[PDB]
Each structure stands twice: as C-alpha cells, then as structure tokens.
Amino acid sequence: LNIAVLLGHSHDVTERELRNLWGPEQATGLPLDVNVVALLMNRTDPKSLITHVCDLMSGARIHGLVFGDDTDQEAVAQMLDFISSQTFIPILGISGGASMIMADKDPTSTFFQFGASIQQQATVMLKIMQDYDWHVFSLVTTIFPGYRDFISFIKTTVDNSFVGWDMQNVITLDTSFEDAKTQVQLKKIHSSVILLYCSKDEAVLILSEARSLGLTGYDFFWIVPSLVSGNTELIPKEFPSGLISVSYDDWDYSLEARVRDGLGILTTAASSMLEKFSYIPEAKASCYGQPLHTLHQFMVNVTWDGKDLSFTEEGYQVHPRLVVIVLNKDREWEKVGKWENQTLSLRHAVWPRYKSFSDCEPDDNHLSIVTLEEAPFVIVEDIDPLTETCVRNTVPCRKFVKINNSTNEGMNVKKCCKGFCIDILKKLSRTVKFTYDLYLVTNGKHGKKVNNVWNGMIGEVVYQRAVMAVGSLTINEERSEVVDFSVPFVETGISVMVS
Amino acid sequence: KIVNIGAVLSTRKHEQMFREAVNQANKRHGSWKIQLNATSVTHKPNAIQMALSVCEDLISSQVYAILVSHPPTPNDHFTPTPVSYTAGFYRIPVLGLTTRMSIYSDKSIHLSFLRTVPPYSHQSSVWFEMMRVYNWNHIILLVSDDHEGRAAQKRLETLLEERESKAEKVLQFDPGTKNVTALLMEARELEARVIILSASEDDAATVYRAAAMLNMTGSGYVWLVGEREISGNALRYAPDGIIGLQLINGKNESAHISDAVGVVAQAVHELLEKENITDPPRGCVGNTNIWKTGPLFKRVLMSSKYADGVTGRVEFNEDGDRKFANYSIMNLQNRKLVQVGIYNGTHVIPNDRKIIWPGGETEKPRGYQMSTRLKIVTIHQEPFVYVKPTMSDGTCKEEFTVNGDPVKKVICTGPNDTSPGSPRHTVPQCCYGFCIDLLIKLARTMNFTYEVHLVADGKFGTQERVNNSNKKEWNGMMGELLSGQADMIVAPLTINNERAQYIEFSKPFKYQGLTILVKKERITGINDPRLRNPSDKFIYATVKQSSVDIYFRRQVELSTMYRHMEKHNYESAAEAIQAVRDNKLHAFIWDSAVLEFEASQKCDLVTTGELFFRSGFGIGMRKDSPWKQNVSLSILKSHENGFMEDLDKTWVRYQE
Amino acid sequence: PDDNHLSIVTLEEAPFVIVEDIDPLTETCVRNTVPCRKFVKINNSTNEGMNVKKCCKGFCIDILKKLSRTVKFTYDLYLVTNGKHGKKVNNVWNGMIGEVVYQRAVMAVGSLTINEERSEVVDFSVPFVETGISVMVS
C-alpha cells in the first residue's frame, strides 16, 4: 500500500533502489494502490521524527512505515511504539536502535521489530551449552533492568530438560562494587561455564574483577547476550579472548534484504487481508484534534519468498535470524553459529581451547586422542534424539563422515563412545586429572607402514596429529619401534574361531 | 548559576503551589549563587501534541527533573506516558506523581522514570502481610488485568518463595468479557476460600455480579482487593465485608508536589557538590547523544535518602518506588467504607474498630473448608482393580466369595480405550477387587466419602517431553493428579525417584519386585546374557509408558534392551498377556504378584526364579495436605493385624 | 550456620552393624569401616563410664557412607547403651526411639522395625529392604 521506508543512517546509501525493490517483485499483485516513499535522515530527535511522521501521514495517507538505524539509540523504537499506539500505523523497525529489544507493548500498539527476544536468546545460549555438553555452570547477573525474567526463564528451562543442569548459585550485585563483599560472592564460583548478564558499562569492570581474581582460564567459559555485544568496532582490552556472544546482526543480510523482507511482510498482509475485507487501509486524518479490521491480529500467518517471517503474541519473530559469534585471539568477532528453523548449526563442531587470553597462560591438560572402533572395546553410536545428549556412560566424540567418495570435504558429526577402553580413559581422567578431545580416525585400521607411511592411529601418533592412542591397539615389533607403549592391561594374543 | 525544573501539571492553583515550592526550596538552602526556575504545562486531549508541547517547551528550557501529575478524568490509561518517553530519549528523569501502573516499574521501557508513589504490586506485599496475621497458607489468585496483573502475580510468587508455599490455583483471563463463571467454579471446587483479586473497575464489577449470582458473599469467603476495586461502579456492587487497600494522602496533590520538589531540590544541591557537571542541551538541533551524566544523576536519585516529608519518610528502592508507604485498610460495613487498619511497611495495626467479616459473626474465617469427598483415580489392574460393566441399570450384581462374604463393589466411571475409534459413551461401571476393598477399608477408618473414577488412557504416567519448546509434562494417572482432576491415587503405582520428587508417597502396602513371564526352556531372570543382545527369536517388551520404562532408562547397562523393547511396547498388561498366550512374544517384564496371579489363572504362564527392583506399591498422594499422616497410619494399622493377610486370602494367595 | 553435625545412634546387630575392636597394633580402624564410640561403665558402683572408640561395618554402615557421600553431611555415630530398639515403659521410651524422641540423636540409621507407635512418636524414611517377621525351624 502507501508505505514509507525511512533510513536514519550515517553511511550514505541511495534511495532509488528501494523504489526498484518492488517493481520486478510482487508478481501476483492483489492490492490496487501500492506506492513506496524512501526517505533518508541524519537527525533522530523525536520532535523532527514525529513531525516527519505526521507529514508522511498527510503525505497521501501512508499506512505502512519502515524505519532503519545504524546507531545504538534504542529509545527511537520506543518513540515509534508510541507513534503506532496513537496513529494506528503498522510500523516495522529494521536494525540499530530500531530493533533493540523492549519488553512489553500495548494492544493499541502495532510496532514490531526485527529481532529476537531475550527468552529466545536464552534458549539459544542453553542450546549452545547443550551442544558442547557443558552441564555444570554458574549464573551471574546484576541490577540491570530485565534480569528477573532472565533468571526466571533459566529456572524454568533447567526444570524443563533431561540434561540435569548442575547449576551453582545465582549471584547478583547491589551497587558499584567495593570489591569487599561482592568479592565474597565471586569467590564461591569454581565451575567452568559462567553466564553473565550485565550492561556494557558494567561488563568491563566485572570481567576486570574476574581477571584479577583468576576467573579467566581456558577451563572456564564466558557466554554473554547481545546486551554487551553492540558496536563491532568498540572492543576494549578487558574482553577475554574466548568470549561467546549471540547477536542478530548478520553481515550476510544487509539493510536492503531486511527492508525487502519488511516490504514482503507488508505486501503479504495487505494482499491476504484484502481477500477477507476490501477497504482495510483507513489512515488517521491529521495529528491535530482527536477501527475494526487491523493487521495487529493478522500478522501471525505470513510467509513471503519462503521465509517464515511469522510473528509472536509478544511482538517478536517466530523463527528469527540469530548469529553466534566468538572472540578469537585476533581480537575480532568471528561468525560461527547459524540457525535452522529451531536448532543450531555450528560451523566448527571442534571447539578448541581459545587459550590465549593473553600470554599469561602456561598450562596444558588437553590431550588430542584418537581411537578406533572395536566391537568389545570401542562401540561408537549415534546420539540419543530424545535428549540430544550422549548418555552418561558414553563420552562425546566426532567422526569426519564423508557421504561420497570424490568429495574430500566431510562433516565432523558428533557421536557417542562407550565400551572397555572408554572406561579405562574415564578412570585415567579421574586419577591423573587431565582432559581430552577424543575423536575417531578416517584413514582406516590400526596401523601398517605403507611405503614409509603409517596409517590409522599409528599415522596419527607418529605424525603428531594425536597425542596418544588410548583406544585398542595390538603391540608388535615395529609398533614398539616407531612409538612407545605402556604396560599391558588385557591378555590379547591371537586365536582361531571354528565351529 | 540556574537550575531549570519542568512540571507537567493539571490545574492553575497547583502551578502557584509549584512556584511556591520552588520559592521555599530557595529559602534555607544557602547563599550560593544557584537559583531554581519553574516551568509548567497543562493538558491536551490527545497525547501527540502533549509530547510535542513538552519537547518544544523543555528543549528550549534545559530542565533537569520533570514532575508529571496527570489526574485521569476521561480515561484511566497511560496519560503520563509521552513525557516519560520524551525525556527518557535524552535520559532526563521523570518523577511520576499520580500514576500507579506497574508497567512503569519495568525500566526496560522507561529508562529514566521514577515515582514517589507505590504501585499496586507492592499491595501484594501487604497481601503477604495478610497471611501472617490469620496464619493463612493456601490462597486462590484471580488476576483479571493482563496488562499489569502478571507483575503482581510475579511479585506474589516471589514473596511466597521465601515460605516455599505456592498458591493453590492462579487464574488469568481477558478484561472485557463477562461470562467468566467457569473460573468461579474452579475457584469454588478447591478447599481454600481466600480470594485475591487485582483488576480495573468494570471487570471487578462483573466478577462481583457473577459472584453474587454464585453465593460467594456468604460465610467462609474472604475477599481481598486493592484500590481500583473499592471505587467507581465496582464500589456500587461491592460485596459487604470486603477488605481493601487505600493510599493515605494518595490524591492529596499539594503536599505531594511539595515533597517531590524537596526531593528534587536536595538531589540538585547534592549534584552541585560533584564535578564533571554537564547540561542537557537544546536537543532539537542535531543532538542525538544522550546527556553524559544521565546514569550518574539517576544513581544520585536512586540512592537519595530522606528523613523529611509532609506525607512522610520518602525513599526509593532498587526499582525506583516509594518504600514503607502507610496504607489504610478499609472494610465495607454494609455499603459503608470503614477504616479498620493501618499499614506501616513492616507490620499491620488494626484500630479499635472490629473487622466485620462477609459472613456471619465476628469470628475469623478459618478458610480451609476441607472436603469429605476425595477424587479417586485408578487403572484397570486385573488382580487388583476389577472393572466390569453393570447388569441392569447402573448397578452391580451382588456376588459372593467362597465364604459367603459379599464382594464390596463400587459404582465407578469407566470410559473406553478408543474414543474416536468407537462411539464413546463414558458409562458408569463396577469396580471391585484388592485395592478397591483397601480403599473401602480406608473410608471405613476415617469419615470421608469418595468418588472412584478411572484414567482417560491406560498409562500410569511418565515424565514425557512435549513437542513445542521441548517442555516436560506428565500424562496418565499422574497427569490427572497434578491437573487437579484427582486427589488420591489408590492404584498399583510403583514408587521410584522421579515420581517422589513431584508428588508424595505413603508407606507401601505391597512389597514386590520385577520379574519375567514366560510360556512353558529356562530363562533364569534378567541375568541371562543371551537376552542382553536380543534378536528376532527373543521377542519381549513391557507396557508403554510404565515404570519399567523409566527404570530401564535410568540403568545404562540395560540400555540395549531399552533400545529393543521400545520397538514393541504395549498399551496395557492384558494385551501383552493375550499376545504371549498365542506365542507372539517370548517373555514379559512386569511386577511379581500380578504375574503370580496370572500363573494361578493359566498354568502355561510361568514366572521366572530371579527377582530385582524390590520396591513397594503405596498410595499416590498430593503435596502438603492433611491426608499424609493418618493415611500412612491406617495402612500401617492394616499391616500390624492380619487384614493384609485377609486381602491376600481374597485374591493374592487364592489359587484356582 | 552449622546444622550438619548430625548425631546418629545405632544398635548392635550381626548382619547390619558389625561392631569390632580397633586394631591394638595400629590404633586405627581399617578404611572400609567407620569409627564409633560406646559408653561402657567400668565400675558397677557408680554411674561413671568411658567412651571407648570402636569400628563399625556391615550393611547399614554402607548405607550411612553412601548417604554421607551423596547428601554431603557430617555424621557422629555412637552405639546405644540403654539396650535394644525400644519400648514404651511407663510412658518413657528408650533405645534408638528414646534417643530420637529425647533429641540426643538426630536420625536412627541402624536397623529398626516399623509399627504404629513408632510412627506416632518418630518419623521413618522409605523402606529399603523387605523385612517382615519369620519363623525358623529345623
């Protein structure tokens, strides 16, 4: 319909491509009067914003509004929510401060953002923690507003899982910390994974206190929401190299694809609501001197260009685009985790140490260990689909599965190992107190020198890709020549099976 | 040196009162060169021009703190919103003075809003203080408004988390609808009579009419509401004896404005003591950056402690709300609002007036009208709960035992298994046997009636995950227990760990273990290693969603059988008996005495020799309830004599 | 807040609470057992007595050790000296029942039957072993 697309930005992007953004699209054009008006803006003060909104509503009765932003001012979305609560205009935010998450809305409000809620982002973070089997963790929050729903959703989600999340205490703060009694709350933390919910102005001080108290080891893990991960450029030195954050900022979907999706949602709602009643667009006459069929209760069943862009009762998206980023040793953010309809898709099933927070970390306990499938010793099975978790006697592993022969590319599909040697490895990890990254070999069987090249586990250990082969392995002369063995543990010679 | 202070105000007299409070704030606060200036705006009927007038006035004014005191004459909804949004854009503090909506408590919307009035949610705190006076522990919460009432429900569940005693039932619905009588019936059927309501005027008048239709003004009923229910047309139709809350000097505007101006004045004179002081500039000319000491000045306002005040001691909490507010506790003495109590923030003191209750005399309502009738659910267990269709008209054929003892049968209600597969009638039916006679002995012991019904689907109940959001739920008899449809499960229920975490257990009346039914070729129990890796010649399974499934899901070395028998689970035990009778199976995993009874029925059915998971059938119970002690004592009284032996002589020991 | 020093009384029975002397050559209980004490009156003339430290093992001792390793509580174990399990004599309980009722013992981990009067005066846990009455003949 009469739809305005406003871009309050700083990087100069032209406007006529937004006029072309509808032309070859809408192949089945059901509405009879659709005109888009693209505007650019450099000042986001609310007086001028409401003035331009009233001018566009007097500007040939614009019924749909699209607003984009590149800044971090999140109150502009709240002002648009107030504008939609009065003028009855469906308004769709895009990015920047236009899509930063606000909690609750009004039934007169028809403003809806393009972003994921903090509850869905908590589901995201607990899915990430489930996919690495990081079961024991801690929760540290502050007095930043929006914390009671966060802790409440975590307490419901732990009580809705077969995982058995062995959670430590929930640590809050009171004021700006004296480092006297909040330090007592921080010293009780001894588990690995810490979920931290605090603002960006507070997170630098809290992570500096954690680094000063030795809470930034590579055994430990720090996962934060999008509250601190704002500007990609602004990265202080106090962020630990190995921080895992989640944000909906995708570099693959720019502002043009987002406003294309917003125009698709608006045209889909206009063309689908026209099939029920004809005269749906009824704009307010003027902003000076003060409806049955609205799109507020019609936005649920929308699907344009295959994208499931459906909306929720709280105003969020049903299947929103999330991005899971890490902080490497290069002090930059790397896009790692992408998203299915409901579940996670990781680019790297291998989770490395990300050890170098700084040069002050000399420790070493992880051991790259390869094994091989033997039926009484190493049974490798699929993960249980009921829990998406290896059962407790099994351990996680990966397998570089190639579907077909010519393609060298394969996927490190996670599976579960059990048996005799797995019990030996677990008891050694209990006694010697070390960690490991157990995985399988794809070169073949145990070991054979194929023209001065060893294959399998011997080829892993000799070429130093694996530290040790804890898995089952026979011992003969040349294997004792090329590597070193331990004391034997089971009387395994050879034998002959007959009837 | 000047300080500008804005004010959104109603009248013209209180404009003069605001200017007089500015003049009094410059009286004793020192001979420093700072001054205080006053700026006042009035109403507009629409809110867009209200925000327009506020920004056009106060961008040019450069104010620090804004006082907003809208009285709702046409509409009671969201009139102080636009000034709050406009100054929260620049993070300028707004002191709300007349509004009390709990949506302002969430600072995720209003970034720089405070208020010197308490909202309705802290009334729930007083309602928590209503529980310690009369030793009440079970309440019934009816929330009408979905705008702010979820915050009051969250505050009530937060304050009852310290006692670890949840409400008996919470109910939520939509304002605007009238026919809410089913919610009142659900409030009726429970034993508690404490009713807690938070609503607007019209929905409160609606539920007052619908409660007057349903005898809810009588004896035992306790009605506990807030300020919005003791006024308007809801006051016209309010039930007598109701307990309500009222703000002391909550609409006294002059002293409230004066106390707020004193708060702002001491905040300013504390702000001038510090350095790095900036001013919020003319924001209309290209100013998108917020005021840099915004959170600093907000932290000054949050930690601003006061001992002075005309209304009283004003103090902000961690969320910017009025602490320790004095409340009036009002009673409705035959359509007369009578003050019967006062509320300081920590304790309640009633006056010399007596609290006349909605029922009869002045005695306090012990609001636990405990039920003599108990909802009983059970499953059709063939040696325990015989379920048999009626003979002539809803009645049981009087059958005798071998000694002439009449079989004590009861008229239960039995639905069929497949409700879409056949025309489903849900007819009453006859229930008797072992556990039924045990229940008849229990009802003979203590004076209570009962209503035996059956489960909708033939499952005991397992911790099963629902599809959306992967959430855990319960089904079966436990699913009908936790949903309030049942009160006491007298059934062959297997005691384990996962059930006792959520419900309570009496002491077990039956002691037995798991065993194997076969057709007679020895098997010798679970320790046959050839069944550890089964094949097409070892066809054995268990009942779908039984306790055996959970017991084999826990033990990891029994996982392989758990990955086999999951392909062949059956809906009930008798179907498995009929399947293994025709040699369509090879073994079956079930409890001891049931399979011994089936061996006493059919000689080809043979129980194995081994035995594992030596556990007990007890009575499935609710949470904290007065049926915990005497039920276990009555079962133990049945154990100390030979009554359990006589029940064994009825069916368990009885061979054929 | 120190509410975990749980005083526990137990009773000497052969299959459950094997009560042995400490090794006189090492003065240490063997590590698969637990320490205990017994208040033995040396002289019969007056009520003087000494708390001889001894060793305990068996079935319920393993239950106590697995409870101490699962719930993670401390426990202070000692034998009863007034006699057997207990019986209401002149409205005065004795034994383990008396040590729980008179609040000198927190819980009764040792072997103990269940009847109506005990469930009146104390509170049992869930039963962990099917132990009724029985008749021995030749």
Ligand SMILES: *[C@@H]1O[C@H](CO)[C@@H](O[C@@H]2O[C@H](CO)[C@@H](O)[C@H](O)[C@H]2NC(C)=O)[C@H](O)[C@H]1NC(C)=O
């Ligand atoms: C102090 O406040 C007064 C009252 O708000 C200000 O006087 C107004 O100044 C504006 C300037 O545009 C005039 O339009 C109004 O006519 C004045 N008030 C009236 C009569 O409404 C005054 O400017 C302020 N002084 C300062 C800067 O401290």
Ligand SMILES: *[C@@H]1O[C@H](CO)[C@@H](O[C@@H]2O[C@H](CO)[C@@H](O)[C@H](O)[C@H]2NC(C)=O)[C@H](O)[C@H]1NC(C)=O
């Ligand atoms: C409550 O309303 C009353 C109405 O009289 C007001 O109280 C008086 O207000 C006048 C004007 O400010 C003062 O001169 C008096 O001192 C007040 N009453 C007394 C104590 O005599 C006021 O608007 C409200 N608050 C108070 C103070 O009760």
Ligand SMILES: *[C@@H]1O[C@H](CO)[C@@H](O[C@@H]2O[C@H](CO)[C@@H](O)[C@H](O)[C@H]2NC(C)=O)[C@H](O)[C@H]1NC(C)=O
């Ligand atoms: C409101 O304030 C008074 C004090 O003005 C409170 O009185 C104190 O209450 C505690 C607990 O009952 C006593 O131990 C103190 O001795 C009391 N002190 C004084 C000076 O009275 C009172 O409890 C509060 N609530 C009400 C109205 O009961």
Ligand SMILES: *[C@@H]1O[C@H](CO)[C@@H](O[C@@H]2O[C@H](CO)[C@@H](O)[C@H](O)[C@H]2NC(C)=O)[C@H](O)[C@H]1NC(C)=O
């Ligand atoms: C459980 O049974 C006991 C049997 O003693 C009941 O206790 C008696 O009941 C009266 C009822 O008024 C109580 O005042 C006393 O505690 C007991 N009798 C006396 C005088 O000591 C108890 O009420 C029963 N509880 C229920 C209802 O389940």
Ligand SMILES: *[C@@H]1O[C@H](CO)[C@@H](O)[C@H](O)[C@H]1NC(C)=O
């Ligand atoms: C901001 O945008 C408006 C409209 O495009 C333009 O007139 C103005 O010159 C711009 N301001 C600056 C300083 O670029």
Ligand SMILES: *[C@@H]1O[C@H](CO)[C@@H](O)[C@H](O)[C@H]1NC(C)=O
């Ligand atoms: C949405 O509309 C389409 C029309 O084909 C169809 O899938 C169905 O009727 C609707 N589904 C929902 C979720 O309402």
Ligand SMILES: *[C@@H]1O[C@H](CO)[C@@H](O)[C@H](O)[C@H]1NC(C)=O
């Ligand atoms: C969502 O599910 C459908 C099948 O219902 C599938 O075709 C589609 O690829 C899924 N989307 C994603 C992102 O995998």
Ligand SMILES: *[C@@H]1O[C@H](CO)[C@@H](O)[C@H](O)[C@H]1NC(C)=O
């Ligand atoms: C491998 O072969 C199968 C069967 O022809 C085929 O479906 C699959 O796409 C191939 N995979 C590739 C292209 O690597």
Ligand SMILES: *[C@@H]1O[C@H](CO)[C@@H](O)[C@H](O)[C@H]1NC(C)=O
């Ligand atoms: C290629 O891989 C497939 C399994 O994906 C396997 O069936 C086939 O034998 C392989 N081809 C050869 C001969 O390597």
Ligand SMILES: *[C@@H]1O[C@H](CO)[C@@H](O)[C@H](O)[C@H]1NC(C)=O
């Ligand atoms: C609507 O109103 C009636 C009035 O008695 C009420 O009982 C019922 O809950 C509602 N619907 C019906 C008629 O069942």
Ligand SMILES: *[C@@H]1O[C@H](CO)[C@@H](O)[C@H](O)[C@H]1NC(C)=O
């Ligand atoms: C209210 O109480 C009476 C008691 O006699 C009974 O008829 C019924 O429960 C109710 N009748 C009405 C609606 O007055």
Ligand SMILES: *[C@@H]1O[C@H](CO)[C@@H](O)[C@H](O)[C@H]1NC(C)=O
């Ligand atoms: C306060 O102002 C001084 C002078 O402009 C400046 O140097 C200092 O950085 C400010 N205060 C702080 C942040 O220490």
Ligand SMILES: *[C@@H]1O[C@H](CO)[C@@H](O)[C@H](O)[C@H]1NC(C)=O
């Ligand atoms: C409440 O009233 C009492 C008695 O007048 C007074 O002492 C107390 O300061 C008042 N508290 C507040 C905050 O109004």
Ligand SMILES: *[C@@H]1O[C@H](CO)[C@@H](O)[C@H](O)[C@H]1NC(C)=O
């Ligand atoms: C329940 O069971 C029978 C047999 O399946 C079925 O015909 C009927 O729907 C129900 N009861 C009656 C009335 O026989």
Ligand SMILES: *[C@@H]1O[C@H](CO)[C@@H](O)[C@H](O)[C@H]1NC(C)=O
């Ligand atoms: C039955 O209930 C009545 C009324 O409460 C009471 O008098 C009696 O003691 C109860 N017990 C018996 C004898 O069933």
Ligand SMILES: *[C@@H]1O[C@H](CO)[C@@H](O)[C@H](O)[C@H]1NC(C)=O
């Ligand atoms: C969820 O999926 C199950 C099958 O796993 C199905 O029986 C059930 O009907 C679905 N939905 C509900 C109502 O839980």
